[PDB]
């Protein structure tokens, strides 16, 4: 029952993370790359700095990771292996975290209200800043869900230990990469 609540949350919040990154790319990013609106000289052609590698992170989750997590729905005690299999992909959170300060200053110093106007126009509860923190939140959350599964899975549960190891290592590597 508890391992099933945790697996359900893992999947529901993965679906929400994918919907969130998709919204960010098809509103805030699309307005910059589109050519439908006038872009502050401050940020013109600096979407690379603003959004970092969030496209590549979304492609991983949307093309691969959510589909593979779904295949472990009835195998919660094994889901640590999903993180071991895809460990290399999570390295792009190191790149994302490294960039995030530069992203935030660029939006502060040079974007004025470009993104606030987009937010209002689209009717979004979440600001560009709310969306751009999400990869940092998600990558520090997987380790909490795996710790929860460890409190309620037998010991056929080194298919959690190794997964958790990976999902402790990634955020620590990302942390250790900051200025």
């Amino acid at each position: 029952r508890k391992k099933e609540f945790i697996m359900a949350e893992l999947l529901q919040t993965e679906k929400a993370y994918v919907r969130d990154l998709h919204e960010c790319l098809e509103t805030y990013l699309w307005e910059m790359t589109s050519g439908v609106e006038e872009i502050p000289p401050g940020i013109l052609n600096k979407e690379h700095i603003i959004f970092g590698n969030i496209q590549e992170i979304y492609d991983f989750h949307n093309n691969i990771f959510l589909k593979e997590l779904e295949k472990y729905e009835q195998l919660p005690e094994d889901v640590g292996h999903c993180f071991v299999t895809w460990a290399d992909k999570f390295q792009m959170y190191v790149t994302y975290c490294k960039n995030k300060p530069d992203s935030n200053q660029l939006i502060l110093e040079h974007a004025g209200t470009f993104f606030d106007e987009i937010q209002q126009r689209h009717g979004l509860a979440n600001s560009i800043s709310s969306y751009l923190i999400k990869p940092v939140q998600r990558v520090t959350k997987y380790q909490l869900l795996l710790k929860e599964l460890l409190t309620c899975c037998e010991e056929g549960k080194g298919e959690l230990k190794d997964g958790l190891e990976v999902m402790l290592s990634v955020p620590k590597k990302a942390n250790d990469a900051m200025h």
Binding site: P101, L108, A125, I133, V136, Q137, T140, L144
Partner: protein, 177 residues
């Protein structure tokens, strides 16, 4: 209409995620405590004036000293939290949370929040603490800590009973208006 970004910080033992879930759903989650609270916004009215309240959790970032501050810029008000039945979490207000919040956000208001109010009078909790030569954190201790860190308010709440819970977020909004 005034947008407010409120970040919730403090040790894992505060139950940050449970606090935020119990507040936004008007219910202790009970069955299962979710680990995920995604960035949230709602209209609340405070002293008449309606307001858009933004809540960010930080659960999972407790060990990542350089990632935590990525949430800090342009915060309107911080909740710095400790558990009333974890003396280590209370000391960490002083050792850990206040220093980094002040470093990144010098002029941003702090509400000091003591969570797990319902456990301060719980025999099993009290005895578990006595066996480690500790007691729960009492009201004057939180008042003293509030003064030491420049907190605009010291407030005590239970996610479990909802005692003082709605007041925490009312006072976070009033710290900004």
């Amino acid at each position: 209409m005034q947008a407010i970004k409120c970040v919730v910080v403090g040790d894992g033992a505060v139950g940050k995620t449970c606090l935020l879930i119990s507040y936004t759903t008007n219910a202790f989650p009970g069955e299962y405590i979710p680990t995920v609270f995604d960035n949230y916004s709602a209209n609340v009215m405070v002293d008449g004036k309606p307001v858009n309240l933004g809540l960010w959790d930080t659960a999972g970032q407790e060990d990542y000293d350089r990632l935590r501050p990525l949430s800090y810029p342009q915060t309107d008000v911080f909740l710095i939290c400790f558990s009333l039945v974890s003396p280590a979490s209370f000391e960490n207000v002083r050792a850990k949370w206040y220093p980094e919040v002040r470093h990144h956000c010098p002029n941003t208001p702090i509400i000091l929040v003591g969570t797990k109010l319902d456990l301060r009078d719980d025999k099993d909790t009290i005895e578990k603490l006595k066996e480690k030569k500790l007691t729960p954190i009492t009201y004057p201790q939180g008042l003293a800590m509030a003064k030491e860190i420049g907190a605009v308010k010291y407030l005590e709440c239970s996610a479990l009973t909802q005692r003082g819970l709605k007041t925490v977020f009312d006072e976070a909004i009033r710290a900004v208006l």
